Design a protein around this ligand. Structure first.
Ligand SMILES: [Mg+2]
Ligand SMILES: [Mg+2]
Ligand SMILES: [Mg+2]
Ligand SMILES: [Mg+2]
Ligand SMILES: [Mg+2]
Ligand SMILES: [Mg+2]
Ligand SMILES: [Mg+2]
Ligand SMILES: [Mg+2]
Ligand SMILES: [Mg+2]
Ligand SMILES: [Mg+2]
Ligand SMILES: [Mg+2]
Ligand SMILES: [Mg+2]
Ligand SMILES: [Mg+2]
Ligand SMILES: [Mg+2]
Ligand SMILES: [Mg+2]
Ligand SMILES: [Mg+2]
Ligand SMILES: [Mg+2]
Ligand SMILES: [Mg+2]
Ligand SMILES: [Mg+2]
Ligand SMILES: [Mg+2]
Ligand SMILES: [Mg+2]
Ligand SMILES: [Mg+2]
Ligand SMILES: [Mg+2]
Ligand SMILES: [Mg+2]
Ligand SMILES: [Mg+2]
Ligand SMILES: [Mg+2]
Ligand SMILES: [Mg+2]
Ligand SMILES: [Mg+2]
Ligand SMILES: [Mg+2]
Ligand SMILES: [Mg+2]
Ligand SMILES: [Mg+2]
Ligand SMILES: [Mg+2]
Ligand SMILES: [Mg+2]
Ligand SMILES: [Mg+2]
Ligand SMILES: [Mg+2]
Ligand SMILES: [Mg+2]
Ligand SMILES: [Mg+2]
Ligand SMILES: [Mg+2]
Ligand SMILES: [Mg+2]
Ligand SMILES: [Mg+2]
Ligand SMILES: [Mg+2]
Ligand SMILES: [Mg+2]
Ligand SMILES: [Mg+2]
Ligand SMILES: [Mg+2]
Ligand SMILES: [Mg+2]
Ligand SMILES: [Mg+2]
Ligand SMILES: [Mg+2]
Ligand SMILES: [Mg+2]
Ligand SMILES: [Mg+2]
Ligand SMILES: [Mg+2]
Ligand SMILES: [Mg+2]
Ligand SMILES: [Mg+2]
Ligand SMILES: [Mg+2]
Ligand SMILES: [Mg+2]
Ligand SMILES: [Mg+2]
Ligand SMILES: [Mg+2]
Ligand SMILES: [Mg+2]
Ligand SMILES: [Mg+2]
Ligand SMILES: [Mg+2]
Ligand SMILES: [Mg+2]
Ligand SMILES: [Mg+2]
Ligand SMILES: [Mg+2]
Ligand SMILES: [Mg+2]
Ligand SMILES: [Mg+2]
Ligand SMILES: [Mg+2]
Ligand SMILES: [Mg+2]
Ligand SMILES: [Mg+2]
Ligand SMILES: [Mg+2]
Ligand SMILES: [Mg+2]
Ligand SMILES: [Mg+2]
Ligand SMILES: [Mg+2]
Ligand SMILES: [Mg+2]
Ligand SMILES: [Mg+2]
Ligand SMILES: [Mg+2]
Ligand SMILES: [Mg+2]
Ligand SMILES: [Mg+2]
Ligand SMILES: [Mg+2]
Ligand SMILES: [Mg+2]
Ligand SMILES: [Mg+2]
Ligand SMILES: [Mg+2]
Ligand SMILES: [Mg+2]
Ligand SMILES: [Mg+2]
Ligand SMILES: [Mg+2]
Ligand SMILES: [Mg+2]
Ligand SMILES: [Mg+2]
Ligand SMILES: [Mg+2]
Ligand SMILES: [Mg+2]
Ligand SMILES: [Mg+2]
Ligand SMILES: [Mg+2]
Ligand SMILES: [Mg+2]
Ligand SMILES: [Mg+2]
Ligand SMILES: [Mg+2]
Ligand SMILES: [Mg+2]
Ligand SMILES: [Mg+2]
Ligand SMILES: [Mg+2]
Ligand SMILES: [Mg+2]
Ligand SMILES: [Mg+2]
Lengths: 275, 48, 92
RNA sequence: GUGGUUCGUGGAGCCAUGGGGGAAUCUGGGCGGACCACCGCCUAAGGCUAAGUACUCCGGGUGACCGAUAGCGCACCAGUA
RNA sequence: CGAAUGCCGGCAUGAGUAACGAUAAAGAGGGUGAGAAUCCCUCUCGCCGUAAGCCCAAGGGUUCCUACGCAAUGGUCGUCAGCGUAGGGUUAGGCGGGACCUAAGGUGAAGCCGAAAGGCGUAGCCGAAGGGCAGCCGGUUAAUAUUCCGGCCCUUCCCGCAGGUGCGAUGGGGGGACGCUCUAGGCUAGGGGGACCGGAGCCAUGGACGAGCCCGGCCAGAAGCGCAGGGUGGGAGGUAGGCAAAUCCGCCUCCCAACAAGCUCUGCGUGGUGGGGAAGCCCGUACGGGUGACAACCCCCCGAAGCCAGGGAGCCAAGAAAAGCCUCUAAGCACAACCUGCGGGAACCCGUACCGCAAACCGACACAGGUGGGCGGGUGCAAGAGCACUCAGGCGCGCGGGAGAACCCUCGCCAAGGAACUCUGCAAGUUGGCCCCGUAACUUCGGGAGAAGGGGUGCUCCCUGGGGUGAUGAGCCCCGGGGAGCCGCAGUGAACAGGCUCUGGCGACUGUUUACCAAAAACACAGCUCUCUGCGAACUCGUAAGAGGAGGUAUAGGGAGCGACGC
């Protein structure tokens, strides 16, 4: 669902907060697999490289497992589903019969008490992770690797996933969260199921703070500035741009493609996007 | 009103201090210059 | 060098006041240690030292004419002697 | 593709060289202002080498130089207040 | 040289002029002295008192104390001083830093990059007002005091002795260890009564010898007991993990126990006992001292925002690190070693004065400005750190004395009128707390509600109901309900204290901005759309290495325009 409120204050008649039911079962993170101060900071060596970041609530970083091939064959029971401030998805804390404890980005439907496991003989079912080439084509999977052993990179945001469309040589073909058709090596590990907390995208912030709480500082439009500041600056009394819509740096911003042309990464991508 | 000089000793030392002046060629040059000029104080007089 | 640690007695209302108890105060080397002083005093005036307190004494800034200056900084050490023991030299 | 020279593309050689191609050992190879033939000059792709020349913080000797608003910012406890 | 709003210097004019720095405020009698409205004392008077009192951090650097002093500095004066000369003055194993820890950041073995200079950067190191760490109450000086002295109480090292044990890490694990809001039960600080203990004294001006008036009736305290709380399960087997070295931790299984107990740790009571101990009177220029008692040192009540603390609940924005500490074992070593007693020793460096919402700091000044944290009493007003008065303390603002003009400022009142004023009701006034009635369009059903509009408000006496603490009784606190009556022009009798409504424009709303002429219909904003990005992402910085994006991955990022919501 999603929490609604009665309009007892303006803005409160609009904000909605996540339904923390899937979560629950645990609040404080696992002191062991989380001790990692998250280094905050909106720019590199002194200079701001990403405008409007900063402020925002303090955060501990939960280190998660983006490559499960480590523990091939060792089963693990799902201990808890927790909240993770650094991602759209929630995470599942799991207890390996091994003793070892790990955090997985919690898949949709993965319940506490269930058992998961990785490897080529993993029983195709939500939670388990296997090398793509061992998963039944048509299977919806998430946290897919893009190149064998380099870690999970595709389909990780709340409620996302990819579907295996076909096999072909050492390569299998995926339909990414973006609608794009990509060829990804058959050895790339992926874990069965969709990401979960797919309701994420519906929460309405409701007010200017909250945006501040998430660490997003106010974004000032180009038109609101002077020429020294941005191409859309200046003009006496509200201007109409001036053709053509461009960024504060100069590159046109309506439709101009930015993907590097001669990129070898092409070839492997068949389709493009959703429109 | 609140004026521009807000004395802080740690600050003064870390910023204008002898060691700070030594860390860079730009600061080492200042020392060279003050010295040549015969300045009695090469570095802002400050203690603790 | 034991006689290099103790520069001289202080001489002053307050200092004398200490003599009643085994409390003799001296002007000592700015760098001297409490422990250094204990020994220095023991061998110099042949006594048993049991406590040593020290404090720095910043020099008074002075001016003779348009010429401005300061007096040398100092260290004062008030050494306490073992029960019933007197530093003869400083009595009188 | 450029720099150096009096040479700013010029008929542009000579000396350096970032790129590409890439030899020969005196029956060799460079130069004499495109280039060619004569006649000549010189031996590249290893290094070293006093003296004559430059300067003046410092010491000295001189002045049709100054004489305390001058002369060094400072004749004085000044790169100070 | 006569000129350059010339340059350096000197001296004029305005001029005995404006000023002398908050309108909190003065008067007098003594004293000192060559001279003081200005220094000292005494007595009156006024001001501050969520202070204009006290304490800490920063900054300042002897401004501290004292003796001689008054040229100058002090907006006047000066015998006085934050001023001149000189002499004194700052005392620590336990307070704060350092012989500890890590934070952003900084630095930087390896390593990367760049014509040079130099830019990065893993481990490490540095880095504090964060984590760690053993002292409380008194007394003394002209000037220091958890530092000196006194009482009581602790901490680490080293050596010896006795008794225990697998002892042994810079490695492993636990622990340190963390948010916002609201909160329980106990306490403590703090405060208020007391007909009750102690106490110099006082009955004035009609009365009162009165439960009369006035002052004080505390503080510290090991072990051991008490009371409140916090932290913690205990066993026994397996054992792929903690870059296996573990008896530890972590996982599995079952013999117990399970709003606990027990063991532990804090807080607070008490505790042998040590200390402190008013008013008033006497001594004293000064500072104080006797005092005044062999001082009493007890009882109720109120009560924290503080302690027990790592307590509980709820919530989303999901809330440092590392060492100390416990534990595990590696090398080693087991005639070492660690651990507990008990004795005898050891325990360095720096700071410590003084000012500190200010005349000593930042503003050229003894500047009406600025300056972080803690304490900040009493009575009343619904409450409070608000307002009025006052304790303690501190001050009356470092020129005065007169005069009673115009005019200026700040303030008070006003006949009849009542916005006729004027760009504009600008300004000022009106209204103002609390309680009870009672409130319209419209609406996103929360609002508009303090809508408006009224009524009540003091005091005396009678009766009566609830609760808190005691004990269920009295007291003492805390909220009420009903009656009669009294007096003023007036009862939130003083101070703090909305004027109301109707209708348009513009932005939704709270918010942000041109520090020193513009706070707005401007920026922002939740929300909507377009567009780029397949992750060595796109974009940004940078020559480069590298870094931000992000230890993120399409319900992400970047860029752009519009700007809740409704159609
Ligand atoms: Mg940096
Ligand atoms: Mg904007
Ligand atoms: Mg503009
Ligand atoms: Mg432009
Ligand atoms: Mg820019
Ligand atoms: Mg200045
Ligand atoms: Mg600073
Ligand atoms: Mg200066
Ligand atoms: Mg000391
Ligand atoms: Mg040329
Ligand atoms: Mg050329
Ligand atoms: Mg070449
Ligand atoms: Mg070449
Ligand atoms: Mg040639
Ligand atoms: Mg040639
Ligand atoms: Mg030729
Ligand atoms: Mg030639
Ligand atoms: Mg020729
Ligand atoms: Mg030749
Ligand atoms: Mg040669
Ligand atoms: Mg040669
Ligand atoms: Mg040479
Ligand atoms: Mg040579
Ligand atoms: Mg010469
Ligand atoms: Mg001169
Ligand atoms: Mg002359
Ligand atoms: Mg000279
Ligand atoms: Mg000069
Ligand atoms: Mg002239
Ligand atoms: Mg002329
Ligand atoms: Mg002139
Ligand atoms: Mg002049
Ligand atoms: Mg005149
Ligand atoms: Mg006159
Ligand atoms: Mg005049
Ligand atoms: Mg006049
Ligand atoms: Mg006047
Ligand atoms: Mg004045
Ligand atoms: Mg005045
Ligand atoms: Mg008054
Ligand atoms: Mg008053
Ligand atoms: Mg007040
Ligand atoms: Mg200081
Ligand atoms: Mg002085
Ligand atoms: Mg003084
Ligand atoms: Mg005097
Ligand atoms: Mg004067
Ligand atoms: Mg003085
Ligand atoms: Mg250190
Ligand atoms: Mg560096
Ligand atoms: Mg670093
Ligand atoms: Mg360190
Ligand atoms: Mg610290
Ligand atoms: Mg600390
Ligand atoms: Mg004092
Ligand atoms: Mg003591
Ligand atoms: Mg052991
Ligand atoms: Mg740890
Ligand atoms: Mg009483
Ligand atoms: Mg009595
Ligand atoms: Mg009478
Ligand atoms: Mg009382
Ligand atoms: Mg006690
Ligand atoms: Mg007690
Ligand atoms: Mg409380
Ligand atoms: Mg360390
Ligand atoms: Mg040492
Ligand atoms: Mg002090
Ligand atoms: Mg102030
Ligand atoms: Mg303060
Ligand atoms: Mg003054
Ligand atoms: Mg002031
Ligand atoms: Mg303030
Ligand atoms: Mg009250
Ligand atoms: Mg009130
Ligand atoms: Mg008083
Ligand atoms: Mg003044
Ligand atoms: Mg009238
Ligand atoms: Mg009238
Ligand atoms: Mg009119
Ligand atoms: Mg008119
Ligand atoms: Mg008005
Ligand atoms: Mg009345
Ligand atoms: Mg109570
Ligand atoms: Mg009011
Ligand atoms: Mg009001
Ligand atoms: Mg108001
Ligand atoms: Mg607005
Ligand atoms: Mg506003
Ligand atoms: Mg601001
Ligand atoms: Mg302005
Ligand atoms: Mg502002
Ligand atoms: Mg405004
Ligand atoms: Mg304004
Ligand atoms: Mg680049
Ligand atoms: Mg990152
Ligand atoms: Mg707009």
């Amino acid at each position: 669902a999603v929490k609604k409120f009665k309009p007892y204050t303006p803005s409160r008649r609009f904000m909605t907060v996540a339904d923390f039911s899937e979560i629950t079962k645990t609040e404080p993170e696992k002191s062991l697999v989380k001790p990692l101060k998250k280094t905050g900071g909106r720019n590199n060596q002194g200079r701001i490289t990403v405008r409007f970041r900063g402020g925002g609530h303090k955060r501990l970083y939960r280190i998660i497992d983006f490559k499960r091939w480590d523990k091939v064959g060792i089963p693990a029971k799902v201990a808890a589903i927790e909240y993770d401030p650094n991602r759209s998805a929630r995470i599942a804390l799991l207890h390996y019969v091994d003793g070892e404890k790990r955090y997985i980005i919690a898949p949709d439907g993965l319940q506490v008490g269930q058992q998961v496991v990785a490897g080529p003989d993993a029983p195709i079912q939500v939670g388990n992770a296997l090398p793509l080439r061992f998963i039944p084509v048509g299977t919806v999977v998430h946290a897919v690797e893009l190149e064998p052993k380099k870690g999970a990179k595709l389909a990780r945001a709340a409620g996302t996933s990819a579907q295996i469309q076909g096999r072909e040589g050492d390569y299998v073909i995926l339909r990414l969260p973006s609608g794009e058709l990509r060829k990804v090596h058959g050895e790339c590990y992926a874990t069965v199921g969709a990401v979960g907390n797919a309701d994420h995208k519906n929460i309405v912030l409701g007010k200017a703070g909250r945006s501040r709480w998430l660490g997003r500082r106010p974004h000032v439009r180009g038109a609101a500035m002077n020429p020294v500041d941005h191409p859309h600056g200046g003009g006496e009394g509200r201007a109409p741009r001036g053709r053509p819509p461009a960024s504060p740096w100069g590159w046109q911003t309506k439709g101009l493609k930015t993907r590097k042309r001669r990129k070898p990464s092409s070839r492997f991508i068949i389709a493009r996007r959703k429109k | 009103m609140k004026r521009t000089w807000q004395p802080n000793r740690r600050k003064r030392a870390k910023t204008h201090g002898f060691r700070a002046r030594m860390r860079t060629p730009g600061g080492r040059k200042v020392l060279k210059r003050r010295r040549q000029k015969g300045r009695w104080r090469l570095t802002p007089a400050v203690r603790k | 060098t034991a006689y290099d640690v103790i520069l001289a007695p202080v001489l002053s209302e307050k200092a004398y006041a200490g003599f009643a108890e085994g409390k003799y105060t001296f002007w000592v080397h700015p760098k001297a240690t409490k422990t250094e002083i204990k020994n220095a005093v023991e061998t110099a005036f042949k006594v048993k030292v049991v406590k040593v307190n020290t404090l720095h004494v910043r020099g008074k800034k002075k001016r003779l004419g348009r010429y401005l200056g300061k007096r040398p900084d100092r260290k004062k050490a008030i050494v306490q002697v073992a029960p019933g023991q007197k530093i003869e030299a400083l009595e009188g």
